[PDB]
Write a structure and sequence with these properties.
Rossmann fold; alpha/beta; elongated; part of a larger assembly; 638 residues; 3 chains; 45% helix; F1FO ATP Synthase; binds 6-O-phosphono-alpha-D-glucopyranose
């Protein structure tokens, strides 16, 4: 007899202690919502980063008899059994909102048992394992240990049904071990991408979404030197009681490449922290956008012919992945946008930003010189106005005596002296630039300028920031950070300041970028092959979506050139909006933020943890409910 | 030798072929300009708290005229951005303040620069 | 009684016969203003000190990246003028903040002052409601409250206009146009005009409070007004904004 109403929960993953990729953020941000329902039932298992584990973990002593409640005693004694053999392991709290209990296993304290396990694994599930691949080596050690620990806990605890959740192939090895060893827990495995997915899309010549249905997986995994790893990810998907991806589009990709239709989607939430007043984010926008104006004034010094109340900021951001993150479509679409805006005789300007890290030798002389020449103009204008203020004051105070006929001065001449005029002219002269020169298209000295994809594309479509161009380009090959001397904004600040995010992704199992952008109340363009577009398509009628600031480009059932054209259509639909229109739209997109919070996305983890229980123990379930509910989906189940 | 505590900064100002200022020159003045601005933000915050204590004495628990404890004026939020400014001022291990502010066209052959290196200033 | 943390400063703006602002009122401002100016001067110095420390770290034996002791920042020269300004704000034992801001003519037979004297809202510390009668019209070049009337209204939280005779009631209306909630009565033109557009249930939620000065006795009314003020005072900031 076990309890389906009151159960344990073990979430295992390679990134529990340490930040490696997106996963760390997901598990972290999801902690609050979970402890608020499990408290000390909930546990997180993972390997130890000996080189960092102390900045993250408050190290709790797991022995003293108060460390665990009464029903959570089994876990303590199952922890004993691990210390018997020599299994070293840190226990404690993760220094993060929600402070969940975290079991960390040292890998080194098992490195010896390497060969036996590599061997045992080869004969159970058939998974090779070169010695030089240090990732899978670690990943096997982990999977075997965590399968051990989970065994003892099923031995002792006899009141709770145990559920274990694994994230990504690296932490998936334990999963086959739990089906062969027929151990008593219910497993979940969430994949956040697929191996063959990231790999088939790397070159960028492969037509992924049309030819994956006809891929020979074993053959391709072998072509890539990936066979062993692929087998683990495959074993994890087949062994798991429940099998989940992070989005509809990755579910497709996963069914034909991991050879199993996933039982559900588990979209990635954020920990959305709202301001006391709804309209606050709107004020933040205009403050942050002011810092951007400062950068722009500096950047276009001596060549500044448009109006900042009438310009919009677009940006793309993320890993430098020219083809997979759509940097190509973006630049291409901007060149098309530039034509459509010149032809309609609009006076708006779009300044487009590309924020993708590339090898560089820091900022250029030109970039830094300009901020400073503008900053010097600013200071001098400040001296002059103080003078002006003295002369206005002297007027007001002494009117109407000494022959002052007017309440206020009338001749600018009697406010602005000639020492004043010389000063200001000198600063203006500094702001001039060599005849012929245009504001550059990049803020840095690049390591390999001639061969740079992003820069070559800009030069091909000839967006060179000439006065006549209505779309301006600025590549900033570095992560935004508030101690940059030039664009002194942290990333999240920059976003609030911008008007529109544009992320035409090709391979993006989730796309934290547009999601995070949405939470700041900034409209964004995404695609239907992006996991966040694919999740939004299903929540909102696509014509109603533009009104919430979520534009979705079709990269799946349109021709390549039609996708680009659609992208320009959205960009241009947006530039046409008025200020009142842009404000109202942000309020709407801000409103959507709730649909991205854990308080709503965590109800999918729940639907998952309870398909693993309806599947583990259908007898105890039908009873501990009322009747029998369909169990082929997480969906059909509720 | 005389164990003096004084310091002499000597400027040489003689026009020589160059490609304008260096990145380090410009970058440094900017990182300091930023420390400046952050400090000035922090101090108006500090001022608002000093003013509060002052206007309120001797009431809600306030026993002394002035604050007596820095934690009452510098909050966590302020400490964090100052620390980040400082970190931006820090230079790569064992790098020294340059002896020249400009990128020099022909630097190996310059007479001033050769003389300085010989005497090892 | 309910042990409320909230405080309510009530203003009364009704032109009466007066001889300009009390000397105490103008001094009070100048005194607080002069503190402010001293505090800026002191924080400028503090800034030079934080800056020096920060530019210099970790050299010359600065172990920590920031100052840690107030003495490093706040020198005794600063401590001394700050204390002089703090003494100047001091008011003689027992003396309380006035209930009026001008020198009245015939202070004794003033209806407002007498009613306030009667109820005894004298601005003492335990009183959770304070009272300020400003017997002149608001205008932005008042030495004391440099605000135009409309500006003042945007400043406040609640307008209270329990008229008995009010054909229209421009006053709760300009208040309403500026997003400030208002208490009015059903014998006022505006109050009636509004009783028509929203059923009194919902009228509370749109920031229009109507007191029943018709089908209730004078005292059931005062009791209703007070009901309203307390329901308001119980509001969170997030609800006031809504
Ligand atoms: O940057 P825009 O979309 O033109 O928006 C400009 C507006 O932004 C925010 O709403 C500010 O609070 C407004 O005061 C400003 O008018």
């Amino acid at each position: 007899s076990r309890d389906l109403q009151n159960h344990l929960l073990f979430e295992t993953a390679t990134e529990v202690a340490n930040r490696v990729g997106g996963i760390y953020s997901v598990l972290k941000s999801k902690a609050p919502i979970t402890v608020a329902q499990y408290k000390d039932h909930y546990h997180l298992i993972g390997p130890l980063n000996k080189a960092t584990y102390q900045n993250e973990v408050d190290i709790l002593d797991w022995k003293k008899p108060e460390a665990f409640s009464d029903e959570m005693r089994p876990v303590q004694h199952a922890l004993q059994t691990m210390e018997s053999r020599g299994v070293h392991f840190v226990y404690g709290r993760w220094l993060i909102e929600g402070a969940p209990k975290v079991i960390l296993f040292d890998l080194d304290s098992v490195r010896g048992y390497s060969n036996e396990w590599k061997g045992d694994l080869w004969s159970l599930v058939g998974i090779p394992s070169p010695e030089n691949d240090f990732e899978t080596n670690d990943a096997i050690l982990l999977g075997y240990t965590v399968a051990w620990f989970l065994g003892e806990v099923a031995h002792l605890d006899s009141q709770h049904a145990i559920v274990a959740h694994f994230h990504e192939w690296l932490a998936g090895v334990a999963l086959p071990l739990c089906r062969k060893r027929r151990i008593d827990v219910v497993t979940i495995f969430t994949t956040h991408a697929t191996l063959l997915g990231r790999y088939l899309c790397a070159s960028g010549s492969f037509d992924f979404y049309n030819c994956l249905e006809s891929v020979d997986v074993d053959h391709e995994a072998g072509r890539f030197g990936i066979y062993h790893r692929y087998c683990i990810e495959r074993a994890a998907a087949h062994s798991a009681d429940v099998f989940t991806t992070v989005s509809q589009i990755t579910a497709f990709e996963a069914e034909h490449l991991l050879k199993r239709k996933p039982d559900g989607i588990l979209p990635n939430g954020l920990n959305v922290i709202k301001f006391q007043a709804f309209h606050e984010f709107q004020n933040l926008h205009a403050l942050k956008k002011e810092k951007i104006n400062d950068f722009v004034r500096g950047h276009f010094h001596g060549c500044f012919d448009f109006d900042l109340d009438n310009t919009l900021y677009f940006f793309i951001a993320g890993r430098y992945e020219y083809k997979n993150k759509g940097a190509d479509m973006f630049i291409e679409a901007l060149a098309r946008l530039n034509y459509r805006l010149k032809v309609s005789g609009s006076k708006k300007t779009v300044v487009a930003f590309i924020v993708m890290p590339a090898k560089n030798n820091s900022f250029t002389v030109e970039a830094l010189k300009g901020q400073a020449e503008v900053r010097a103009l600013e200071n001098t204008v400040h001296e002059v106005t103080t003078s002006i203020g003295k002369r206005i004051f002297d007027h007001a105070i002494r009117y109407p005596h000494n022959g002052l006929t007017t309440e206020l001065p009338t001749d600018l001449g009697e406010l602005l002296k000639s020492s004043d005029k010389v000063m200001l002219k000198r600063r203006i002269l500094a702001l001039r630039r060599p005849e012929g020169q245009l504001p550059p298209i990049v803020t840095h000295n690049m390591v390999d300028d001639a061969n740079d994809l992003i820069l070559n594309k800009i030069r091909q479509v000839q967006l060179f920031n000439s006065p006549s161009d209505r779309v301006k380009m600025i590549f900033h090959p570095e992560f935004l950070n508030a101690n940059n001397p030039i664009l002194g904004l942290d990333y999240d600040e920059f976003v609030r300041g911008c008007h529109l995010g544009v992320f035409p992704s090709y391979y993006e199992p989730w796309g934290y970028t547009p999601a995070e952008c949405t939470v700041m109340g900034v409209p964004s363009i995404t695609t239907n092959v992006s996991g966040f577009g694919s999740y939004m398509e299903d929540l909102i009628e696509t014509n109603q979506a533009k009104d919430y600031g979520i534009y979705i480009v079709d990269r799946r059932f349109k021709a390549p050139d039609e996708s680009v054209e659609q992208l320009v259509d959205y960009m241009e639909e947006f530039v046409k909006k008025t200020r009142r229109q842009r404000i109202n739209q942000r309020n709407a997109t801000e409103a959507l933020s709730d649909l991205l919070d854990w308080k709503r996305m965590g109800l999918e983890y729940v639907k998952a943890r309870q398909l693993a229980l309806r599947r583990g123990y259908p007898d105890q379930f039908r009873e501990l409910v009322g009747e029998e509910l369909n169990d082929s989906n997480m969906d059909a189940l509720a």
